[PDB]
Amino acid sequence: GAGNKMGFVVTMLKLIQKKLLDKTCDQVMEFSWSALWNITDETPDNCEMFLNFNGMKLFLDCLKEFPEKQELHRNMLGLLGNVAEVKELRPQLMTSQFISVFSNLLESKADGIEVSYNACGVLSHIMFDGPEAWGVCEPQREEVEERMWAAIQSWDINSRRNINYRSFEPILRLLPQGISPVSQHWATWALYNLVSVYPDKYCPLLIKEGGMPLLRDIIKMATARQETKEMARKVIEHCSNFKE
Amino acid sequence: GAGNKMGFVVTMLKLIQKKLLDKTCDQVMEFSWSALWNITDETPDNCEMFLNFNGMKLFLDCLKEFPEKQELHRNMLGLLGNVAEVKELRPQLMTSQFISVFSNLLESKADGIEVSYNACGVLSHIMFDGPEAWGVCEPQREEVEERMWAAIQSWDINSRRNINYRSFEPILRLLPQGISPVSQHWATWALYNLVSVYPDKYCPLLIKEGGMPLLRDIIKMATARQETKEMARKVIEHCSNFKE
């Protein structure tokens, strides 16, 4: 149960706006975006409120004013990763302005890999909707696709992470599809990194939520790139080693 | 996905403690408890962190220092309602001190019915675990039971509400059981109030989550009190009228 979730989102956005006008990205600014990231975890109605309360404007403003604040970018892109999981909200992200930001951030080195990873996750859910959903002229879909492949291959698979998942369902939904091989690749990489580095936390979660048959299905899939099948097999092996 | 949820809980508890030492229950104090209520919605790990960070001490302190602050009590008991849904955490609530607080609050008139309702929900999940779980001498289980029946029957079924549900699953789990008839009664009342006053929001949620067969099962149940079956039938009728 809950109270007024709308007042919570608005209070955070008002705090962010005040810190923007103060031109100050301190622990309070970072906390407010972290709070939004946290409260949008598997909570689509909070994602919708962030957009409906002009949150994207504050996102863009903060990117412009604080281009070197790495933790800020991590928190903002974590929030947008949650927004991007809600299919009904993804059309709001399909603007040349927003897509260029997400594509540019694929090359971010901020907070290790977290900004690049979170931007790749946003784009993975966007590309899952197919070329019909891509109504943007700049950049072109296939350019962003290549930037996504290059981003994923650039990340250390043994990276320690500043992100937590309570469920893999949004990531698992990217596996049984041939619409967007790059989205399936990002999802498979996400699972592989997390079971490799944090098996005690994430192997039982992946097993309980049915990840194993989905990954074996990838290995038998024609539209799946060879690199995706290789990673899927390694996730199965890691999870099997954990079960033993 | 999410970031550091632990820092969020701790920051709220630190804000609450500072307002306690200032002896000030203002909008900031109320917001901090509302934030905890909101972030514990269907989120057991946040409930566990609240308890592990000495949250119950702050709860008791605030009840003592601010006995007439109605919105504060609503928010605090909403948070505890979320904690009480987590079976692994309910043993922490089984102390004479805590049970007496929840039982006393059944007669609260604060914020309409919200404090009484939230305290009754806490006790409904506690009593769902059976008499074996009741290790408290004062008060006795059957006294609290009677206070719960009297509370539920005192509430206007047409009450407007200051609570939101994103799922009825914790309430529905109280229906198919004969361990605690009063818990089943509270759960049935909760559904009846919400489909009566907010059918556009809650009839589709109850229907989608399988509430109808559960309520019909109650009508066929021997351990179910007649008043519970009457309410269950009315919920079915309201939901059927809505479907038509």
Using CA atoms of A172, A178, A181, A186 in order, give the dihedral in degrees to the nearest 10. Answer: -10
In this structure, are residues A206 and A244 in contact, taking their beta carbons and an 8 Å threshold?
A: no
Technique of determination: X-ray
Considering the domain B5-243 in this protein, what is its CATH number? 1.25.10.10
Does B166 sit within 8 Å of A34, measured CB to CB? Answer: no
What is the rounded distance in angstroms from the CA atom of residue A98 to the CA atom of residue A94? Answer: 7
Q: Interface of chain B against chain A, CB under 8 Å?
A: 1-5, 7-8, 11, 31, 34-35, 37-39, 41, 43, 45, 74-75, 78, 81-82, 118, 121, 162-166
Q: Which of B38, B41, B165 to mutate to test the interface with A (most CBs of A within 10 A)?
A: B38
Residue B215 backbone dihedrals phi, psi, to 5 degrees: -75, -40
Q: What is the resolution of this structure in A?
A: 1.5
Amino acid at A226: Q
If one counts every other C-beta atom within 10 angstroms of the C-beta of residue B88, the result is 9
Structure tokens at B133: 């779980």
Q: Which residue of chain A comes nearest to B5, CA vs CA? A: A38
CB contacts of B81 in chain A (<8 Å) are 1
Domain ranges within chain A, ordered by starting residue: 5-243
B139 prior amide bond cis, ω within 30: yes
CA B186 to chain centre: 10
Measure CB to CB from residue A39 to each of B39, B118, B163 and give the nearest one.
B39
Instruction: Please provide the DSSP assignment of B27-96 as one string.
Output: HHHHHHHHHHHHHTTT-HHHHHHHHHTTHHHHHHHHHHH-TT-HHHHHHHHHHHHHHHT-GGGGGGG-SH
- Please judge whether A1 and B82 are an interchain contact, meaning their C-beta atoms are less than 8 angstroms apart: yes
CA angle B35, B41, B154 (to 5 degrees): 95
Closest CA to A35 of B9, B50, B137: B9
3-state secondary structure of A232: helix
Instruction: Measure the CA–CA gap between A186 and A205, rounded to whole angstroms.
Output: 18
**Do A162 and B7 lie within an 8 Å CB cutoff?**
no
CB B106 within 8 A of CB B151: yes
Give the chain B residue whose CA is nearest to the CA of A7: B31
Chain B CB contacts of A11 below 8 Å: 31
Contacts of B139 (CB under 8 A, 6+ apart): B96, B99, B100, B103
Distance CA B192, CA B194 (A): 6
Kindly write down the DSSP assignment for every residue of B82-134, as one continuous string.
HHHT-GGGGGGG-SHHHHHHHHHHTT--TTTTHHHHHHHHHHHHHHHT-GGG-
Phi, psi for residue B40 in degrees, rounded to 5: -95, 0
The Cα B2–Cα A42 span in angstroms is: 9
As beta bridge partners, residue B2 has A164
Residue of A nearest to B81 (CA): A1
Torsion sign across C-alpha atoms B33, B38, B39, B45: positive
> Quick one: tokens of A201?
């936390």
Q: How many helices (H) and strands (E) does chain B have?
A: 13, 0
Q: Which residue of A has its CA nearest to B7?
A: A31
SS3 A206: helix
The answer to whether B120 touches B148, Cβ cutoff 8 Å, is: yes
Q: How far apart are CA A185 and CA B44, in angstroms?
A: 31
Reduced to 3 states (helix: H, G, I; strand: E, B; else coil), residue B209 is coil
Nearest to B84 by CA among B71, B98, B72, B97: B98
- The DSSP H or E segment spanning B200 is helix B199-208
